[PDB]
Amino acid sequence: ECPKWDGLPLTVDVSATFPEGAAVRDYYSQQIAIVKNGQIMLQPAATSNGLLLLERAETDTSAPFDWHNATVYFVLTDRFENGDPSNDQSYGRHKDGMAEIGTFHGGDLRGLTNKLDYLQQLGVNALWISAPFEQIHGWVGGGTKGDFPHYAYHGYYTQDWTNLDANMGNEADLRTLVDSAHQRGIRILFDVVMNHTGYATLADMQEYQFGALYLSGDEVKKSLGERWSDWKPAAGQTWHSFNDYINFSDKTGWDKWWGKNWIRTDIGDYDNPGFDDLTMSLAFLPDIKTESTTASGLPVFYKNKMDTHAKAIDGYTPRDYLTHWLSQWVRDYGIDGFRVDTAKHVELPAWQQLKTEASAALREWKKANPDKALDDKPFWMTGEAWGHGVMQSDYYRHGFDAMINFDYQEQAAKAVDCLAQMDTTWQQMAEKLQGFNVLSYLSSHDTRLFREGGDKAAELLLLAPGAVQIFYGDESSRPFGPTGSDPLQGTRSDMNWQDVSGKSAASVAHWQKISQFRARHPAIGAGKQTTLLLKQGYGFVREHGDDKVLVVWAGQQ
Ligand SMILES: [Ca+2]
Ligand SMILES: [Ca+2]
């Protein structure tokens, strides 16, 4: 079934697609062929995996930006590039000195800035960065076995949506990142959370005077230290054992935290979690009362956090606060979009509200900044709803321009040793997505890293219809990292920069060529597909607007 290949030049019927005598470039090898009998004959480049990325040779620059063609690069900032090591251990955070599974390694906004020319060479149109908001300051026990201290190095444990986390940089650093990204054609997505707050941690309890301990008076100082967060497991204990100093029952102490009006939780005297998706608690993270219709005031512990930018606003609910707070980042910096976490676990009119206010914020920034706005496009919003597929679901009606597509990973794993197998999926996706966008990927921070087939991953991904998501280090086969007893941890390992210019430089160049080809033809991500019948191999035509491409794979070997 799967096509085999001579290893010798390759003859193609371009008779339907390209005029006669016209010049056709193979973007990969750069060879230009003139059509003779409705035919061209090209030898694919050695590093090509049998591909010919046939474009009209008149094309000479990247196509205007379209979300339906977008190449989104998703980075965990702390794990990417350390531009500033003076901010690596903010708020008393330490490294663990034992594998660093869950510590802040130090990646920050200035380093990510440094790396923008690299990213545009990779054909990246959108930069999805992990939430830069101020996280919980300390750590919880990591893995099922208390194997390591787990901090908020990934941005999902937000504590104050109005501040930057000091590990990330300051306001000047964010603005420099966003404006350098825009000057290079790269839009900025923030990763965003409204379902939950971060965990309670020893560092935060000590710093903002909330919660409660079993220890009293001098026992606190005798067992915990001057800095409670600095605790280490004793003999036979694990990193979960610090819980046994914390009294999670105590009403008075735990009411001085977020507040009964803000969250549901087993802790203290708070409304307890529910059993449906909206009101349940994931991984014992407290669920925010997004549906509450009653004015809540600030989180109670903000009384003790003098450096917050949050201000009480008459009649606002928790939802109102979150959507105002999120929107200010857009209004002040011109963020282009949000990727929304745990979207199944918050009611849909809350996301719609978030989208309403974020769009007004982006419009308002672009009007204030006509020199910095690349264009007039509205705010964009994508969402992680677990296991969503290629369907225009209810999410589309409530503010989501595109959902993350979980079904592509397995579809691409099937076609590792035969690009041709993607055809079915590629036909359906090209058809279906004439009416809506999705975001597809190979590697995820909460699934696995796609490392089969080496750099074949490139064409498995970048040829997808719809917007695609390069998980950072896909281009360089970034290894799965230390993980301990949390199976997902190794997916968040350091970018392998040494490999980028050494052992993996060929993989990166392969990715570069295929991704530039995509950036150069909106037909790839948005066109309709006709699959060709050829004498040797697999191939297809994509066509959208006035843009046609022909993509041919020779065969195995
Ligand atoms: Ca740093
Ligand atoms: Ca919820």
Side-chain angles (χ1 to χ4, degrees):
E1 307 203 338
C2 275
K4 282 75 177 175
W5 175 46
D6 276 332
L8 297 163
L10 207 73
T11 309
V12 179
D13 183 5
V14 303
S15 65
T17 312
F18 297 110
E20 189 69 75
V24 186
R25 184 181 290 117
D26 166 59
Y27 190 73
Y28 200 89
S29 69
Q30 292 289 305
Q31 314 184 19
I32 302 165
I34 307 297
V35 187
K36 289 184 178 181
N37 294 324
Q39 283 181 345
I40 56 170
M41 204 189 297
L42 280 172
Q43 174 71 252
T47 58
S48 66
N49 298 320
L51 295 173
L52 296 175
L53 306 173
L54 295 174
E55 67 183 6
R56 261 158 25 87
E58 295 85 357
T59 173
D60 60 0
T61 187
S62 58
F65 177 67
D66 186 3
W67 287 108
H68 210 281
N69 206 26
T71 298
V72 180
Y73 192 84
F74 166 37
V75 294
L76 291 180
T77 306
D78 187 74
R79 299 296 175 88
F80 196 63
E81 176 60 18
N82 194 1
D84 182 3
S86 70
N87 64 6
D88 290 333
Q89 315 118 34
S90 301
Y91 318 116
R93 293 165 178 167
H94 299 281
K95 291 205 109 168
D96 68 1
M98 32 169 258
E100 316 293 350
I101 297 170
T103 54
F104 298 61
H105 300 178
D108 60 15
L109 292 172
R110 180 178 298 170
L112 175 58
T113 299
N114 315 146
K115 303 290 200 152
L116 289 170
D117 291 335
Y118 173 78
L119 292 179
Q120 83 174 347
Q121 288 165 354
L122 192 58
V124 171
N125 299 121
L127 186 60
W128 157 17
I129 72 172
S130 58
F133 314 123
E134 181 177 359
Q135 301 287 297
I136 60 175
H137 291 174
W139 54 265
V140 303
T144 67
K145 304 179 194 178
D147 192 355
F148 62 89
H150 184 191
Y151 288 82
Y153 69 87
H154 41 71
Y156 292 91
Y157 299 161
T158 296
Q159 192 181 18
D160 189 354
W161 282 266
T162 71
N163 292 330
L164 288 173
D165 189 312
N167 264 86
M168 290 292 110
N170 70 8
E171 296 87 3
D173 298 322
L174 180 61
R175 195 185 314 283
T176 302
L177 167 63
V178 173
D179 294 339
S180 299
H182 287 154
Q183 290 175 356
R184 293 169 172 83
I186 303 165
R187 276 73 180 170
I188 298 295
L189 296 308
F190 283 2
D191 202 339
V192 175
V193 169
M194 277 171 55
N195 199 29
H196 57 270
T197 67
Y199 300 111
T201 78
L202 280 182
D204 301 315
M205 294 170 64
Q206 196 180 15
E207 186 170 358
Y208 303 126
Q209 320 202 27
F210 68 87
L213 302 173
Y214 293 121
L215 305 169
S216 182
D218 304 335
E219 283 177 345
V220 166
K221 181 57 156 52
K222 189 180 188 301
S223 294
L224 284 182
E226 215 177 72
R227 281 204 34 223
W228 303 351
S229 181
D230 290 345
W231 175 88
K232 305 266 176 288
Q237 279 174 339
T238 77
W239 285 94
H240 293 292
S241 303
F242 78 90
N243 283 306
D244 284 314
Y245 306 106
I246 300 171
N247 178 350
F248 288 112
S249 293
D250 179 317
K251 176 179 173 70
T252 291
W254 288 109
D255 267 342
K256 316 161 94 106
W257 195 17
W258 277 99
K260 62 180 68 180
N261 296 337
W262 270 88
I263 59 175
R264 284 177 285 271
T265 191
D266 297 323
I267 298 165
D269 194 12
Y270 282 36
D271 298 346
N272 281 90
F275 293 166
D276 58 340
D277 284 330
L278 299 180
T279 57
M280 62 167 66
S281 175
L282 285 298
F284 306 97
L285 294 166
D287 177 35
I288 308 167
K289 285 180 172 179
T290 55
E291 84 284 359
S292 174
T293 69
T294 65
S296 66
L298 294 179
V300 180
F301 91 94
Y302 284 4
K303 288 184 176 180
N304 296 322
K305 189 178 186 295
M306 305 307 167
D307 63 21
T308 188
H309 286 87
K311 289 283 260 276
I313 298 169
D314 289 323
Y316 275 8
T317 67
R319 185 197 294 170
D320 297 337
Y321 280 112
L322 291 170
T323 57
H324 175 68
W325 290 341
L326 289 175
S327 293
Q328 281 300 326
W329 298 101
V330 183
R331 169 62 189 91
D332 297 345
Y333 292 92
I335 308 302
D336 301 304
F338 290 160
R339 179 271 190 182
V340 166
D341 183 73
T342 42
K344 285 184 173 177
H345 298 283
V346 171
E347 68 279 18
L348 298 82
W351 300 123
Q352 175 64 59
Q353 172 172 356
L354 178 59
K355 182 64 177 287
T356 306
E357 305 197 16
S359 295
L362 181 55
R363 293 198 305 276
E364 190 180 351
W365 184 83
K366 287 178 185 283
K367 197 270 180 186
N369 286 297
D371 297 335
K372 296 184 177 184
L374 298 178
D375 64 10
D376 70 5
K377 294 189 173 301
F379 195 78
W380 195 70
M381 173 155 151
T382 184
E384 197 207 27
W386 189 263
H388 203 281
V390 189
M391 280 295 300
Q392 184 178 3
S393 66
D394 285 330
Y395 294 104
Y396 295 65
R397 263 83 71 194
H398 290 97
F400 288 97
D401 294 299
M403 297 301 288
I404 290 165
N405 178 13
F406 288 42
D407 285 331
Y408 202 95
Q409 203 173 21
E410 191 260 335
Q411 290 159 344
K414 278 184 177 175
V416 163
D417 308 323
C418 187
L419 185 64
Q421 293 199 10
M422 294 301 285
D423 180 78
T424 301
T425 300
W426 281 347
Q427 294 193 11
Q428 300 173 358
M429 285 183 64
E431 180 180 354
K432 296 179 177 293
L433 301 178
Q434 297 298 313
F436 66 99
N437 202 5
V438 296
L439 181 61
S440 306
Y441 64 94
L442 294 184
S443 308
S444 186
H445 71 290
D446 57 11
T447 67
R448 71 187 179 91
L449 302 174
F450 195 104
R451 293 298 180 259
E452 309 96 357
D455 68 358
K456 294 172 192 176
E459 55 273 28
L460 289 174
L461 178 62
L462 298 172
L463 293 176
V468 303
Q469 173 240 308
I470 306 171
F471 191 53
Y472 73 96
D474 277 333
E475 69 277 22
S476 67
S477 300
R478 171 172 65 84
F480 186 87
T483 59
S485 68
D486 182 343
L488 302 171
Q489 284 298 330
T491 64
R492 298 89 178 273
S493 65
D494 292 333
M495 186 59 188
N496 52 338
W497 290 112
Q498 190 180 26
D499 297 346
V500 159
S501 70
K503 309 165 178 68
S504 301
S507 180
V508 171
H510 181 71
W511 279 86
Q512 279 174 355
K513 298 189 185 79
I514 297 170
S515 173
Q516 276 158 336
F517 183 69
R518 173 183 173 88
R520 184 181 269 209
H521 302 289
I524 292 294
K528 297 174 187 175
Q529 163 162 341
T530 305
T531 304
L532 303 180
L533 275 301
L534 292 92
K535 193 181 292 180
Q536 198 173 12
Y538 172 82
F540 60 90
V541 176
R542 300 276 175 95
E543 186 174 358
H544 180 79
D546 57 3
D547 181 69
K548 295 187 182 185
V549 297
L550 185 153
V551 182
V552 158
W553 177 59
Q556 300 191 5
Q557 284 193 349

